């Protein structure tokens, strides 16, 4: 498995993540080997959501979040991805937030 | 401080105009509406047969204006109801 594209000597030495780097190589890598990739990819999508949450493009975030909820139901991001959009009156959402609280 | 700092324009949501919204009728089908208005950007996360449209603009170093459109459909994809919020409250 070509996991060599998810590291480097410098990125490895200082103990930092590579999840916010181009993820396309990890998707190619996808082909319990898939648990790591599941979360490495979900973190990417989450980080993008955070960027736009701070920037304020929350509608695109909502669509990305629905993509995450549909395609990765079992990752940590499913909780992390829950929230900028809540400034708008939405027919909330609350049932899934409460049902899976932990 | 923030109120005098330069900001790029913010553009979010889909385009809306009276020329198209005034043409939408109850009984009009999702294919006809999608043609007239364009592909929806938002939908119900739980599969409710309803469409939402949002037109939000905030010029740089200015405030934000937003209009929304709500479309309620039956099980056949035929619009049953409609609402609209021309401005934020």
């Amino acid at each position: 498995t070509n996991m060599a594209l998810d590291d480097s000597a410098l990125q490895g030495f200082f103990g930092v993540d590579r999840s916010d780097r181009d993820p396309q190589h990890a998707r190619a890598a996808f082909s319990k080997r898939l648990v790591f990739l599941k979360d490495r990819l979900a973190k990417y999508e989450y980080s993008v959501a955070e960027y736009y949450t701070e920037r304020g493009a929350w509608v695109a975030v909502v669509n990305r979040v629905e993509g995450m909820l549909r395609d990765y139901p079992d990752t940590q991001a499913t909780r992390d991805a829950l929230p900028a959009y809540r400034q708008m009156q939405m027919n909330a959402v609350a049932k899934i937030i409460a049902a899976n609280s932990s | 401080l923030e109120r005098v700092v330069y900001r790029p324009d913010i553009n979010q949501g889909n385009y809306l105009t009276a020329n198209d919204v005034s043409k939408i009728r109850v009984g009009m089908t999702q294919q006809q509406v999608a043609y007239a208005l364009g592909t929806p950007l938002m939908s119900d996360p739980f599969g409710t047969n309803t469409w939402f449209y949002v037109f939000r603009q905030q010029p740089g170093h200015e405030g934000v204006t937003q209009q929304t459109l709500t479309l309620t459909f039956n099980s056949s994809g035929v619009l049953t109801n409609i609402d609209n919020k021309p401005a934020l409250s």
Binding site: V35, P73, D74, I96, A98, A99 | -
Partner: peptide, 28 residues
């Protein structure tokens, strides 16, 4: 090298008393 060894469980969220889902990236 050991990061994958976390082996976090892939538990799905349960529905409240139904979100849109797909079958891509399935676990065989």
């Amino acid at each position: 090298d050991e990061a994958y060894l976390e082996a976090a469980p892939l538990a799905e969220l349960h529905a409240p008393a139904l979100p849109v889902t797909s079958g891509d990236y399935a676990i065989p």
